[PDB]
Amino acid sequence: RMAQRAEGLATVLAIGTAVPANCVYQATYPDYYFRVTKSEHLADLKEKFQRMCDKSMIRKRHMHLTEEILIKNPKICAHMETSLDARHAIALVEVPKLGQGAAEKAIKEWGQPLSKITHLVFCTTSGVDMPGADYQLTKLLGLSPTVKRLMMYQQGCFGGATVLRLAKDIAENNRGARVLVVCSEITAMAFRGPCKSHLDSLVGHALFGDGAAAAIIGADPDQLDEQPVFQLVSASQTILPESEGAIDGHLTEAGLTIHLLKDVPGLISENIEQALEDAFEPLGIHNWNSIFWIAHPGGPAILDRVEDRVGLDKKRMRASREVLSEYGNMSSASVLFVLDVMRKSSAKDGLATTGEGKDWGVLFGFGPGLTVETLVLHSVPV
Amino acid sequence: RMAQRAEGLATVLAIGTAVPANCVYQATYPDYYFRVTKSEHLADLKEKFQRMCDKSMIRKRHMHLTEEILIKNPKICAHMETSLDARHAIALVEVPKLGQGAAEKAIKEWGQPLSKITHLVFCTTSGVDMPGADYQLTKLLGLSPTVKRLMMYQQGCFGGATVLRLAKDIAENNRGARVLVVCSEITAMAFRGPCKSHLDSLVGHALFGDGAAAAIIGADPDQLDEQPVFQLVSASQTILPESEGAIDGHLTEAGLTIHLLKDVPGLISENIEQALEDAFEPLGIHNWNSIFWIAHPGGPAILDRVEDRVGLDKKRMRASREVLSEYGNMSSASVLFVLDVMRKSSAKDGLATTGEGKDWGVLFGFGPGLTVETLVLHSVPV
Ligand SMILES: CC(C)(COP(=O)(O)OP(=O)(O)OC[C@H]1O[C@@H](n2cnc3c(N)ncnc32)[C@H](O)[C@@H]1OP(=O)(O)O)[C@@H](O)C(=O)NCCC(=O)NCCS
Ligand SMILES: CC(C)(COP(=O)(O)OP(=O)(O)OC[C@H]1O[C@@H](n2cnc3c(N)ncnc32)[C@H](O)[C@@H]1OP(=O)(O)O)[C@@H](O)C(=O)NCCC(=O)NCCS
């Protein structure tokens, strides 16, 4: 036991990202969406969708699904037709392939041989299968057949926080472990035409985009060959009081359906200070403008309400809002994109640490429960 | 970091099991199965299914699905009709409820307050949903809202080994952590009528049953208040060479379909010696009759081929064969039932350890990949 284990904290050693090449601009999206679903006669519904997209603070999203694919799969354009098998035909191939794109970029930054990856954690909310995306990615990358795998399916938007919590315990308990974490999302599972009876589906179609992110996590980094980016200090999870049914998602004959209450930004903002105190009181930290912020960009209302309740300067949410602007809500992958934006912009602006010059940081994932996952991070010098 | 972590090995502190009350005897099952699926005109197929049931070495299985439920859900009785929503309506309720039955039993054996459970790992192969079964069980048991959860969906028959590997790293890396692990399986997702085009489906219908198992895992057991049952020494995982496509499962519009090659018992038995050497050579153990055996009872051919290739005395597989006889193949739950049978029959026969009087043991999970998971165990004195 005593020398089977690592000594130091789990550390992010590399981050990489990938998105589908196909880019949909938000400014023209209501026209596109109502045209390809043959729903232009639903004029009041289209005006509601236009207001949602104008308020989204999204400039563009990357989507694997193209009009050519929608023309070949018309049942996906209906609101609620039997379509799971046609959706799985796309997502069970594209989720591992997008993850491979991200993982290759992480592994290139890390610079170590594939044989040094001991563990793989793969997270998605886009389809399920056996063997899973973890097995498919093992095959695509040429990982060791002895790689220890964790397949995290149907996770939702806190999944990016969950894979870091998992990688922390693996990296710290196993000397020499190097964990590859990959989050990969393809919205072909959930895309459907609009309907007056499901206005919360319309909100999902204004926000959700595709993407994959990957990191290499290890404890006891090699002084010469590896370069720390962030340390993972602590990980917590809670179910919010009075939140039953706020965010539900069902995998059905008609694909993935989303059930989203208007109460979500309120429920999160009412409970976020208690999550901060629980994570930071043991470290003697109380000033929420003195830490860097990695907030899951679930939508602009969640970030606005948290900023207002906690009293943040507009700088604190900048990295989260840049990801929302350039990619939308990529479910489990989003927080790894925010970490990557933050460390790259910190170096580019000549700041002293990977966390915008701050030492301590917080990462928040939000999803069904309503669940809030809270990680404490430490930056490293630039 | 050095304050945050436990000292000793992750230990099983309690094990509990539960099955649906409804019991189907194997002797009469071909008549039942062909009658409730209205398939009596398929004479040749029924004779083939009779031979599979006679060779199964299964005396009975527990099944939530009853004839009354099958009468109300006729599309579940067809071979391949649209039926996922009807199957999910059963399994998304019954999986957490059967898990609750097992978890209550484990918690009673342990005797500590519910507030001492810090982590929950829930594994199933029977349906997916958001929030998941882990959330539903937290609600059913009244676990703390701060319980850190891992939801392991669409795992398959190595999932029982996987939750123990996860619990080992959590329990060892987190001082005071107590992990509730729960595996719960309901075959309503996969049950379907017979077809001459899918003989591997027929094999699934001869073998798979319903069941849930739970354990409490912790490191540094309290001298006065806790009593270890097994120690978790090491956990490995490998993909077998030349095994592509041996075991596939798809979640489709028609529910969960299984694709099973006749090659499976050969592939496992040809690679098991190497898995034993990898796990035990570092402990200086070479004699496979000197260790206790927890083998996933995937079917009688796997146990027979492993026993013959490795040269085991018939005593070694007794606990695995007893679980196969009394419950059939309960996917991810099966190995925890075997651990429970082994420790109970060891005490009843007055043996010196919970592992049939042996010090060291091996647990094997088998599933899609083809994946073999290998855990080294240590017994405790009786
Ligand atoms: C969608 C969003 C960008 C709109 O911005 P906003 O400042 O609230 O703008 P408004 O309040 O004017 O809302 C625009 C329209 O969206 C509708 N809307 C917003 N949230 C909705 C929901 N959950 N269900 C149904 N309609 C919703 C409003 O009713 C309004 O319809 P109307 O103009 O016909 O009355 C914003 O509400 C948001 O970020 N919410 C998402 C939070 C969330 O749940 N994200 C997590 C995803 S898991
Ligand atoms: C099915 C089983 C219980 C009985 O088979 P057995 O002891 O080999 O006896 P037999 O060879 O007479 O098998 C009976 C029939 O099963 C058929 N069968 C066995 N495995 C099969 C498979 N994977 N696909 C199709 N048919 C299969 C045989 O072809 C035979 O058909 P027949 O009687 O018309 O010739 C045994 O093969 C077994 O335990 N197999 C392991 C199944 C497995 O992979 N388990 C893990 C599932 S994850």
Numbering used by the authors:
A (entry chain A), B (entry chain B): 10 to 391
Sentences from the paper on this structure:
The initial crystallization experiments with purified HvCHS yielded high-quality crystals that diffracted to 1.7 Å. All three HvCHS structures are highly congruent, even in residues lining the active site. The only difference can be seen in the β-sheet and loop from L269 to D272. Based on the electron density map, this loop appears to adopt two distinct conformations in all three crystal structures. However, while in the CoA-bound and the CoA/eriodictoyl-bound structures, the “in”-conformation has much higher occupancy and was therefore chosen for the final model, the “out”-conformation is dominant in the naringenin-bound structure. When mapping the active site residues known from the well-studied MsCHS enzyme, and our HvCHS structures, it becomes apparent that the residues in the substrate-binding channel and especially the cinnamoyl-binding pocket are highly conserved.
CHS is the first committed enzyme in flavonoid synthesis and belongs to the superfamily of type three polyketide synthases. Then, chalcone synthase (CHS) condenses one coumaroyl-CoA and three malonyl-CoA to form naringenin chalcone, which is subsequently converted to the (2S)-naringenin by chalcone isomerase (CHI).
